[PDB]
Amino acid sequence: MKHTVEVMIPEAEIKARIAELGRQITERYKDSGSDMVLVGLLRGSFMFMADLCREVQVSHEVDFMTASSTRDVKILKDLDEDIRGKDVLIVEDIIDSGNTLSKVREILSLREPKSLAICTLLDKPSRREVNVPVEFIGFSIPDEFVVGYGIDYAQRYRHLPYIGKVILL
Amino acid sequence: DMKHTVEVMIPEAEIKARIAELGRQITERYKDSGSDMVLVGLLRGSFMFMADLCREVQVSHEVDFMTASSTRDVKILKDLDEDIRGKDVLIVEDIIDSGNTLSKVREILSLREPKSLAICTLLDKPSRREVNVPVEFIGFSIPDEFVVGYGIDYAQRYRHLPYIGKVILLD
Amino acid sequence: MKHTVEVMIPEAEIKARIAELGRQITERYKDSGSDMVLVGLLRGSFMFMADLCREVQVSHEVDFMTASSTRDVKILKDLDEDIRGKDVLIVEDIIDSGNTLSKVREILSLREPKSLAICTLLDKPSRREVNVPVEFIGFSIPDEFVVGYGIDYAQRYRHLPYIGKVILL
Amino acid sequence: DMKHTVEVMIPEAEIKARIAELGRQITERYKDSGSDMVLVGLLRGSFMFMADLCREVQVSHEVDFMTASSTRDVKILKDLDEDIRGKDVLIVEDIIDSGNTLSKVREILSLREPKSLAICTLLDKPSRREVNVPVEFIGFSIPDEFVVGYGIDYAQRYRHLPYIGKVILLD
Ligand SMILES: O=c1[nH]cnc2c1ncn2CCN(CCCCP(=O)(O)O)CCP(=O)(O)O
Ligand SMILES: O=c1[nH]cnc2c1ncn2CCN(CCCCP(=O)(O)O)CCP(=O)(O)O
Ligand SMILES: O=c1[nH]cnc2c1ncn2CCN(CCCCP(=O)(O)O)CCP(=O)(O)O
Ligand SMILES: O=c1[nH]cnc2c1ncn2CCN(CCCCP(=O)(O)O)CCP(=O)(O)O
Ligand SMILES: [Mg+2]
Ligand SMILES: [Mg+2]
Ligand SMILES: [Mg+2]
Ligand SMILES: [Mg+2]
Structure with missing residues (x-):
């Protein structure tokens, strides 16, 4: 459990990347007409959601849901x-x-939305058991032990403004 | 809520006998399955029906519950355990x-890929069906009348009735 | 895990006891005037709730809630x-x-009801770390391994019409 | 919903500066505690405020959320993790x-007996207070106007605004 944290993706680099993500998302949905909604998966995406939706220049709603912790995927909290x-x-x-x-x-998808897309801050292509389409990715990283920016390690480091790496001593 | 009266549509004895029959049918279907079985009730209206039905199901199974919402989207207020x-x-x-x-x-x-998936309902109002959904076990197919009792409510009332009754307004 | 189940409290004995419980509860709340509600704790009390509320000759509502699994008591599902x-x-x-x-x-109690009472089917006085007032008790039993009537053992025997005892072989 | 206009009440820069200040105050209070710390946000309106605030809190803490309902009883739609x-x-x-x-x-x-319990709110409308509740950290005390932005909505709108604005109808 003895460890330490080094900066992997600085606060400024995250902010710049989200700014670009915001422009991409805006470009795709600004000429839709239908209502838009960003759905966050609690509670690792709350910080990413906050910064991202502010960079999306399209009128949209913000909703959250909480999924399960091989077992089945259960919904602890559904959309409001x-x-x-x-x-x-x-x-x-x-x-x-x-x-x-x-x-x-x-x-x-069962609730039949007009469109359905996924935006992720980090992506680990190495670990992948089910191919799911992802349209917006902030960073592709190797299978590293990362924390910060909503991502935790034993309910810790969620509040870090940067993406850091955990070094097991 | 308006002034009304509750008249018996399906007596307590008729329900007990019908659930006993339903039990034998369900038992005969899943007795040679071998795989684990689970009865999933949809709260709140199904709590009484579940209690009596699972006691008539003579196979080793589990009892679980879930709560769903409602043209609105069907949301999961309480998932399975x-x-x-x-x-x-x-x-x-x-x-x-x-x-x-x-x-x-x-x-x-169905997304969770069970071995098999089936539905057992106590009451059925086919004259109100808007979507074709396959139901395999039906206790009673009933006419288009607002029924109460046996878990079913009217303004959160009459859930505790041991029989199925119908609400008749005073006009 | 190897075991067996013997009948401890037969179906008829439970039914008779609940009939008496129903009369007691009816006697206390029939001259109240205020609305009444039976709150069941899922999912061990669903069968007891079904039989009990039918023996209560007072107009009441039926609601359910799901509490936590030393840790804190959390509410997985609140009252409707x-x-x-x-x-x-x-x-x-x-x-x-x-x-x-x-x-x-x-x-x-924080929601300030007129009155607040507890009715239990089984009671184990032996195991008791917090003294909580209980007004209606169906059966007082020694610290035995009981199942049935909503009570489970590894998600099993919940559907038994009787209270049974588990014998570890 | 009626025809309206959104005018800025608290600019983005004013919020960032104020949250920075709030961060220093919260940090100075719990830095010598030693016991574990947790920020509990009340969904949905507080998600943005939480994200910015916890980044300004320079002590090792946890972030959790819960969802409460509403003269109705305050029910827990989603408890803490x-x-x-x-x-x-x-x-x-x-x-x-x-x-x-x-x-x-x-x-x-409070029933769960934490070591200490405190409240931090971004906005405050004391001219609407019906119950005396002790708040220790307040970002802005504001006049009696319907505000939107920064997580706060009007008919599920304007949550994504980086500033605090006010809705003005067209009469
Ligand atoms: O380096 C990592 N650091 C901390 N977490 C990681 C890392 N790598 C993968 N995770 C877990 C991320 N997973 C989110 C669940 C977070 C664990 P929970 O909050 O206890 O439920 C995504 C799994 P999915 O692809 O099926 O959605
Ligand atoms: O006579 C009736 N009496 C009380 N209800 C009825 C009756 N008839 C149809 N309902 C509504 C029952 N519907 C469930 C909603 C329950 C009301 P809730 O307490 O707000 O969850 C059936 C759903 P379905 O679309 O699959 O048939
Ligand atoms: O002989 C027993 N047989 C099966 N259970 C027993 C027995 N004895 C005490 N239990 C557990 C009963 N407890 C209810 C929880 C059921 C376990 P869960 O469904 O996994 O959450 C009451 C504890 P409380 O007094 O704090 O309310
Ligand atoms: O200008 C305002 N704009 C949007 N809302 C306001 C405003 N002013 C007071 N509200 C309602 C906010 N209240 C929370 C309810 C949020 C609405 P929900 O999405 O249905 O959960 C404050 C609860 P309190 O009694 O502790 O002060
Ligand atoms: Mg996640
Ligand atoms: Mg129902
Ligand atoms: Mg229990
Ligand atoms: Mg709020």
């Missing part, structure tokens, strides 16, 4: 609002195996 | 009219 | 309806240490 | 007017 006939962008902190988002996307 | 993957799942509902809600609930549970 | 200014009777399958009901009663 | 027993708990709210909801939420969390 409806998504039928809307443009839905799922906002996740990091995707590895892609199990959770795969199931979450299926569940949300 | 256990996994249904590779298990015989029997959804237990109090009454079907539109079939919108139950259709969606079956779709969600 | 309000209890403010109402007569509330908490319905539990079995009470031992009395930790959960103690916390649940505190939480419900 | 972690335990708060023996921990410094700081509730993080977007705005206080009546104070009914937050009063009840504090009561529920």
